[PDB]
Amino acid sequence: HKSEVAHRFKDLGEENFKALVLIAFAQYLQQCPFEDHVKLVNEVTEFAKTCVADESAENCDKSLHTLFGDKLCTVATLRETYGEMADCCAKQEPERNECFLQHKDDNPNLPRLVRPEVDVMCTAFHDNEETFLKKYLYEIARRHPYFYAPELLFFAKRYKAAFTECCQAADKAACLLPKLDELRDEGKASSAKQRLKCASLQKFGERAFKAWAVARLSQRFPKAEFAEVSKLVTDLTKVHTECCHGDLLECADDRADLAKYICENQDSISSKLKECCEKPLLEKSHCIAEVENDEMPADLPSLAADFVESKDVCKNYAEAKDVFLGMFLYEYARRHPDYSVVLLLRLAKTYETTLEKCCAAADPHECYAKVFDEFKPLVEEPQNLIKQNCELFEQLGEYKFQNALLVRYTKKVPQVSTPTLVEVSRNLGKVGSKCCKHPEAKRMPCAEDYLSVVLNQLCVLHEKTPVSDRVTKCCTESLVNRRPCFSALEVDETYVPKEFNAETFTFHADICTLSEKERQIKKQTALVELVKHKPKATKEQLKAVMDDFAAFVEKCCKADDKETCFAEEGKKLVAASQAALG
Ligand SMILES: CCCCCCCCCCCCCC(=O)O
């Protein structure tokens, strides 16, 4: 148009426009007070309304990157507060904006946000709901500057819907609390994934990312033709690159665009994209991204026909090595919405490797007619791991299950910090509960979704505090082997047991008055320490000690002289145990 601002205003809306400006300035000027941003937002919104009235109004012709940078350079305490960043204001536009993205601190040292009391929250939500949510929106935003604004705005409304529904119920706490935990864990998962995708695109590069996107895209759109999938996979990769770079506008438009292309060419991609294409500008992308698979043609020929038999495979392969392989992926992927993307990539690689060691022999045709037989083992390893673990998750509850992992992993890498083995083994227990609830078909894709963030979160720690050469060998290894590596770790025999520290096994009557979360963490923490002390204890020996302890807790948090029962009955447990574990 004549005006970028007036244009954004009209199709975004006054409400969303204001929330986004706020979030935007918060991701850039992370040290200025809330009251300071609320003034800029008003300043900018009063301006946008000026252009909607007259596109010709002075400055309305400026580009959003220019108007934005211009306002940023209006902060007088910029040089003092941010210093080096104020230097950016001396460069003109192409450079300036590039300079800001640069001096943007990813994880700034601000205090951990504490969750106030449900009643104080609900009350703040009553007197002034907008400033209540705008303040926390501001707090979240400044702490996660690379978080996609529109997505942040999406969470905001789910938060308002919980305070609207829960602050009205008699049992507020029983209402509000489980949602805030859900929302919190969902936004944290959503954030790690984004930081995780940008990390891959960096380490391994385009090829690997494209391969990945092909299998995922063709899994969702099993009907779309390889031409469309190729198209999208290419446009997609262009998007992640720009969004990763952290430029909000260049990333928002790129997503809007591809969403439009996908909606216009809808009938050529998926049948389950209806609703998403009927939603507004600021939701189309997020909708489609979280969309469901389409029913596969099921009029599908087969794969051993075009990739194992048909001589002229090496012919079609040498002509264009990747498109052929991409054709394998697209073909194999769309026929298996139940395989994890990495499993699919694990197969395409196997195929690639075989094609390279057979198209260079006398009779190729009879060299690669055993490949599909080689897919068998690669497929069953993760399949068998699922049942096995989902079966055990039923035999015991979530809590009893996490204890099994605790004992299992502490034995693999005992060198790892106890508070780390506990958290890690806790999240895993959750991945098992969130996924084992699903039927066979949707299991593998689920586990991969979760395991991927957990396994990375766990690696980033070894990134700062290396402990084992092993855990470090899988963390560095390619993402397609970054999981089968951990499944392969064996009990450490080199490890030399720790020495008794009664304090680690001294439980004062505190536990009796602690929430489930605390009773467990306390018990689990000793469990790890127990295995670290006696790493050769059978699953039997160990079950015993855990038994004589389950009872103990009762006998002393259900009896009239708490504290004496912990000192007297305690010495009997340690004594007995010390000798049971011999
Ligand atoms: C040296 C041996 C001292 C004995 C230490 C006992 C530690 C066992 C903690 C296991 C907690 C199991 C959880 C539960 O029973 O609910």
PDB file of C-alpha atoms and ligand atoms in Angstrom, residues 399 403 500 505 523 526-527 530 545-546 549-550 577, ligand 1:
ATOM      1  CA  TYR A 399       5.760 -42.370  40.149  1.00  0.00           C
ATOM      2  CA  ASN A 403      11.714 -44.838  40.108  1.00  0.00           C
ATOM      3  CA  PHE A 500      28.260 -43.599  53.418  1.00  0.00           C
ATOM      4  CA  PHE A 505      19.994 -41.221  54.807  1.00  0.00           C
ATOM      5  CA  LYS A 523      12.662 -40.068  48.389  1.00  0.00           C
ATOM      6  CA  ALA A 526      17.991 -40.814  48.230  1.00  0.00           C
ATOM      7  CA  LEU A 527      17.114 -43.608  45.819  1.00  0.00           C
ATOM      8  CA  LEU A 530      21.462 -45.378  47.359  1.00  0.00           C
ATOM      9  CA  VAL A 545      15.254 -51.555  51.078  1.00  0.00           C
ATOM     10  CA  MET A 546      12.530 -49.547  49.345  1.00  0.00           C
ATOM     11  CA  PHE A 549      11.366 -47.696  53.908  1.00  0.00           C
ATOM     12  CA  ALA A 550       7.832 -47.294  52.574  1.00  0.00           C
ATOM     13  CA  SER A 577      19.889 -52.054  55.101  1.00  0.00           C
TER      14      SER A 577
HETATM   15  C1  LIG B   1      22.586 -47.380  53.183  1.00  0.00           C
HETATM   16  C2  LIG B   1      21.116 -47.745  53.029  1.00  0.00           C
HETATM   17  C3  LIG B   1      20.194 -46.707  53.660  1.00  0.00           C
HETATM   18  C4  LIG B   1      18.750 -46.873  53.195  1.00  0.00           C
HETATM   19  C5  LIG B   1      18.280 -45.650  52.417  1.00  0.00           C
HETATM   20  C6  LIG B   1      16.835 -45.773  51.985  1.00  0.00           C
HETATM   21  C7  LIG B   1      16.591 -45.031  50.685  1.00  0.00           C
HETATM   22  C8  LIG B   1      15.402 -45.615  49.959  1.00  0.00           C
HETATM   23  C9  LIG B   1      14.577 -44.540  49.280  1.00  0.00           C
HETATM   24  C10 LIG B   1      13.633 -45.172  48.271  1.00  0.00           C
HETATM   25  C11 LIG B   1      12.286 -44.479  48.235  1.00  0.00           C
HETATM   26  C12 LIG B   1      11.258 -45.353  47.536  1.00  0.00           C
HETATM   27  C13 LIG B   1       9.980 -44.582  47.259  1.00  0.00           C
HETATM   28  C14 LIG B   1       8.796 -45.103  48.060  1.00  0.00           C
HETATM   29  O1  LIG B   1       8.931 -46.161  48.713  1.00  0.00           O
HETATM   30  O2  LIG B   1       7.729 -44.456  48.034  1.00  0.00           O
END
